[PDB]
Amino acid sequence: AEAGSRLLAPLKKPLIVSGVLQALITLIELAPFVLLVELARLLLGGAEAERLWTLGLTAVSLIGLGAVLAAAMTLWLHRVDARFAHELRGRLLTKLSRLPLGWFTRRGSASTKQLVQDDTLALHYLITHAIPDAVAAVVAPVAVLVYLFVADWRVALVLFIPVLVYLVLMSVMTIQSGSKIAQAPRWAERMGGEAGAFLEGQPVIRIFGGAAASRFRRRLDDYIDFLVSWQRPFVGKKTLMDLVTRPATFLWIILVAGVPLVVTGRMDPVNLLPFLLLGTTFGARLLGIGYGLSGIQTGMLAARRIQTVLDEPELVVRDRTRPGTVELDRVSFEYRPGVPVIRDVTLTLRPGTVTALVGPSGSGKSTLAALVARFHDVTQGAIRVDGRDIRTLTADELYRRVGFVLQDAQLVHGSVAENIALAEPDAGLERIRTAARDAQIHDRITRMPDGYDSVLGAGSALSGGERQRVTIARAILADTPVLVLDEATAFADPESEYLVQQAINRLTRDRTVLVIAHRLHTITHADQIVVLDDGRIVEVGTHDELLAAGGRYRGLWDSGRY
């Protein structure tokens, strides 16, 4: 696979050496049994004792040398694999930092977890074991069989019977499970998505249907049906391979072919000693790669998935190359091709002005905020911050110029100090208390058991309106020249909403602010009110001008009183 060779290119020389070392090791692991054959041949021959001690002690030590070399070789090769995955996992996280945000929405958090963690873990056998097992499974059966075929071709041919049966069993097993191996990672992604939604959507499941009617229960039953149909023939062929390749199976068929040749005057019992001692050894090497073809197939698929994401388009920072000003020029955008959401929007945001973005639900006002953040590139037109295109700005410059609150008060697993200081983690507690105080959340944080160290993990510590005021505190602490407030203060009560708004006006007096609100009574003070209907600017003006116009804004304002 091209996508697999490109990804595993850094491990070219480590993997070549692991193949060369295992050829030497497995030869060393077979040397004791060649010497034990000579020890056995000389015990029958009545040789001198000191010669037997030489063969006996050398053979026992060579068993120790092979065990030491084998253990050391897998240790180094396991650490090469461990260091590659850290390098690879960090590469993926670096890549995902830059991808357009439509990648995350169309995929989900369960597929990202499978990508960064499970798919990199799926490469373990391919990197650490596939080449060691392949070289062992080649050189050891080949070295043993060539040694034994010279010893006796009659018994040596009979050793091919379990070998050929093993090759047929793994080949048939490989073609059968090839389709299921490819289908397997999709099912894990789906079950991770269902399991994640099952855990996250627990209030919905508890009230609507419970366990019985849940989408997770059905997919759980379907997944096990896939596993049983996948694993029953796979495990069934696995055991026949183990039975075929076992030492007891080789030893029995050596004796079935051997004893009649010895009872009759066709073979000496001395010449059976190579078969009894070495004939039973190479079966375990054969089973190593036979059990391992699935690891290679899954690893090669995972490497293909990983390199596909690392080849993704990236929202590049191009080298094309008034303060606080943001200008939208002929901006258009499509979440999906052929589905307009923004249509030729032209707008300018100037310092010391409050711009209110209003309109019907689903008109694209949150999309415009995301476009200024450059979560997605505009399909047409341009968005320029302080005279420079954001496609030319780097991420640090872009997000130091403009700050965001996003209508979906996402909180990370950490303390409220870590959440409020998300923008500037090096900020001090004195600043955090100041930012939290302005966001009207400091009093709540004081009442917590651990105070500002209290953790904000899953299902903890805050109501919906309290989460939003934490994210406002984050934006205050960032202290960027431009600010965007996507539906902020939506869950805030009127008494608390006034205090937060008054603080925002105080802090952003001389700064560019883009407020987005459905509650039109809260944006009467805006310098300009921009009405976005069906992804296009239908009217622009002050509150009185838009009311007198008798257009969409007057309709929304009149309908606000019910």
Partner: protein, 564 residues
């Protein structure tokens, strides 16, 4: 292993007895097959090789019987492995919706996610891949030692002497690596929860510039994951060294006794040569145990997570049912107390809702409004006090009857990844298309179907992520209205909807033709239109309540609330 037998179904305990008998029989047959070479080669090397036929016949019978035993052991191991898989996974799927909502901490959610994530082929093939070779590899040296007693007593004792060394290495190898393996799993489990957080919180992280691995929390969890992973590879070195010493010590003990007997005439040369083959067969399980022992410790963590969910505290329930399935019940609290941990939310709430009426709940943010609705729907339960539906305590009510009594609109609309229609149908999957259309038309979701290109087949993201904030809110409202439950709970349905859509939705919450007792947790004075009663809740009790005109006339906290 003690933990796995706990998870075995009771209906399969007949198969475990058969599996155990065949598993012991597998070891006995393999060991007899190995020691049957000593008389066979002794007869083969003798002056009368024709005597070798008797021992080859017994070897053929023992080996053929071994194939039948180990094939059946594989069928039962597969059946037992998947029976435990489907039993535990279905039990966890059944149990988790009944587990107390306080149990879903970030640590336990990781445990439940990993426990559910164990559904793959690795856990299913547990009995085939781990227990069968572990039991065989552990008992095979002991069975060869017992089998060798019929050839020579001290030789069998010497082979049993090395068995004790094998178990000594087996116990110590797990003991040395148990401290490091626990950290490796814990740091690897934290890394899972940060990738999910990383993907789920990209906008907030990207704006905050906490997205690059040098500055991100997932990058820090990756650095700790790597350090704990490399530490595990190092602290596992003593175990592999200790198994190698055990194998070498057993080799010296076995070979030392064989040579000692041979020079003293108690053991012929062919018997001694035959024991070299039995020595190799005796020593192969020493290496097999070494390869399987690291996998044994990861299984113990896997089964512990599964048992952690199965031991999770399910919520109290009964077997009562409402007097009528669809009639509007009266909702009342009788001095309800509630607290999240030590932080109190409610401190003696007592109200009564008339059946079939619509009442409103308003108050400051963080007051307890969402907690009140959760207690009515049974998501939470009081620390003390009681909630009664139609005069029947919900804590003593059937989970089916309790679940069917309430439909809710949540403050934060969560939609499952799927089509827009599938999320509406969750309210009542058995409803006919006429009923589903009525629910969508009431919730103004019909307008979405015109604007959206795929209509009701629009693919909703994780949550309602692939929909606007106001679009997913109306899909949630259609879901709640479709359900025929006689109690409707509404929580900030106005938050994400524009003025035109808000007014239609608010009118639809009461224009719904079913008779329901409605509770409206609202944000605006206009949002509580058509409300028969209003409850003002502040600091965990209903400080004030009454009609809208009554409270405005009194100029109480209700009037001060809208004055900002």
């Amino acid at each position: 292993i003690r933990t796995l037998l706990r998870l075995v179904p009771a209906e399969k305990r007949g198969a475990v007895a058969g599996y155990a008998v065949l598993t012991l029989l597998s070891v006995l047959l393999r060991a007899v097959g190995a020691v049957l070479l000593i008389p066979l080669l002794a007869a083969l090397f003798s002056d009368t090789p024709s005597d070798a036929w008797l021992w080859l016949g017994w070897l053929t019978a023992v080996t053929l019987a071994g194939w039948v035993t180990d094939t059946n052991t594989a069928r039962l191991g597969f059946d037992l492995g998947f029976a435990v898989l489907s039993r535990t996974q279905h039990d966890m799927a059944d149990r988790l919706p009944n587990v107390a909502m306080s149990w879903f901490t970030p640590d336990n959610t990781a445990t439940a996610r990993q426990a559910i994530a164990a559904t793959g082929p690795e856990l299913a093939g547990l009995v085939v891949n781990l227990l069968t070779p572990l039991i065989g590899a552990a008992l095979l040296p002991a069975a060869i030692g017992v089998a060798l007693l019929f050839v020579s007593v001290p030789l069998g004792l010497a082979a049993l002497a090395g068995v004790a060394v094998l178990f000594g290495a087996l116990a110590l190898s797990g003991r040395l690596s148990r401290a490091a393996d626990k950290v490796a799993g814990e740091t690897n489990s934290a890394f899972t929860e940060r990738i999910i957080e990383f993907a789920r919180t990209q906008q907030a992280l990207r704006a905050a510039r906490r997205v690059e691995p040098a500055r991100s929390q997932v990058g820090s969890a990756l650095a700790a994951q790597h350090g704990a992973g490399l530490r595990l590879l190092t602290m596992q070195i003593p175990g592999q060294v200790l198994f190698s010493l055990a194998g070498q010590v057993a080799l010296i003990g076995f070979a030392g006794m064989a040579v000692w007997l041979t020079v003293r005439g108690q053991l012929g040369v062919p018997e001694a040569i035959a024991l070299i083959v039995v020595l190799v067969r005796y020593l192969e399980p020493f290496a097999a145990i070494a390869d399987l022992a690291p996998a044994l410790e990861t299984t113990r963590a896997t089964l512990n997570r599964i048992q952690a969910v199965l031991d999770a505290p399910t919520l109290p329930a009964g077997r009562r049912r409402l007097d009528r399935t669809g009639a509007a019940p009266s909702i009342e609290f009788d001095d309800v107390r509630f607290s999240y941990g030590d932080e109190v939310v409610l401190d003696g709430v007592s109200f009564t809702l008339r059946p079939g009426n619509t009442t409103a709940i308003v108050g400051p943010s963080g007051s307890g409004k969402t907690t009140i609705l959760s207690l009515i729907a049974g998501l939470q339960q009081p620390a003390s006090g009681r909630v009664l539906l139609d005069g029947v305590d919900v804590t003593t009510l059937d989970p089916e009857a309790r679940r069917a009594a309430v439909s809710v609109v949540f403050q934060h609309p969560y939609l499952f990844d799927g089509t827009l229609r599938d999320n509406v149908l969750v309210g009542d999957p058995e409803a006919d298309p006429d009923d589903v259309t009525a629910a969508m038309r009431l919730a103004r979701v019909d307008e979405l179907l015109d604007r959206l290109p795929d209509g009701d087949a629009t693919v909703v993201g994780e949550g309602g992520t692939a929909l606007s904030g106001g679009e997913r809110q109306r899909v949630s409202i259609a879901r709640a209205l479709l359900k025929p439950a006689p109690v409707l709970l509404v929580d900030e349905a106005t938050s994400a909807l524009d003025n035109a859509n808000e007014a239609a939705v608010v009118d639809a919450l009461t224009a719904d033709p079913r008779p329901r007792t409605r509770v409206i947790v609202a944000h605006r004075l206009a949002s509580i239109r058509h409300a028969d009663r209003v409850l003002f809740v502040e600091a965990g009790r209903v400080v004030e309540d009454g009609a809208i005109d009554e409270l405005l006339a009194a100029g109480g906290r209700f009037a001060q609330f809208w004055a900002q």
